[PDB]
Amino acid sequence: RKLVHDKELAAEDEQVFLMKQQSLLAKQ
Amino acid sequence: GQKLKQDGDSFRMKLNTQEIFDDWARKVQQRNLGVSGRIFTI
Amino acid sequence: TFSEILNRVQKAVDDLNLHSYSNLPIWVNKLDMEIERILGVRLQAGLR
């Protein structure tokens, strides 16, 4: 039972977050 | 003083600023600006 | 001198870990790999 290493919490890129909020606005 | 009254009267009617205000207010009626909407825009 | 620079990055990563940033195992794992690479090529040229 080692230190089982956590998943790398990644900062989202500005293009993929802007296409996500483009999808969020386009669903609104 | 005839010529001073004539030329300053012509310069005075050149210095009326009513047309700039009326073209300005015409331009903002032609814009017709609305604030409201989603406060981020993409 | 090697012990000095690793003590400098030891107090630097203590200053990092006081400030509470994300993803410290990944980043200091990458940098520990980089210092392991540099110490490998230094030990290689030193044995030469």
Descriptive account of the structure:
- This is part of a larger assembly, with one copy of chain A (28 residues) and two copies of chain B.
- Chain A is 46% helix and 0% strand.
- Chain A has one helix and no strands.
- Chain A is mostly helical.
- Chain B has 42 residues and is an all-alpha fold.
- Chain B contains two helices and no strands.
- The termini of chain B are far apart.
- Chain B is rod-shaped.
- At the A-B interface, helix 1 of A face loops of B.
Q: What keywords describe this structure?
A:
part of a larger assembly, 3 chains, A: 28 residues, mainly alpha, 1 helix, B: 42 residues, 2 helices, 64% helix, motor protein, Dynein, AAA-Atpase
List the topology elements.
This is part of a larger assembly, with one copy of chain A (28 residues) and two copies of chain B.
Chain A: H1 14-26
Chain B: H1 2-14, H2 18-31
PDB class: motor protein
Keywords: Dynein, AAA-Atpase, LC8, tctex1, motor protein
Entry title: Cytoplasmic dynein-B heavy chain bound to IC-LC tower
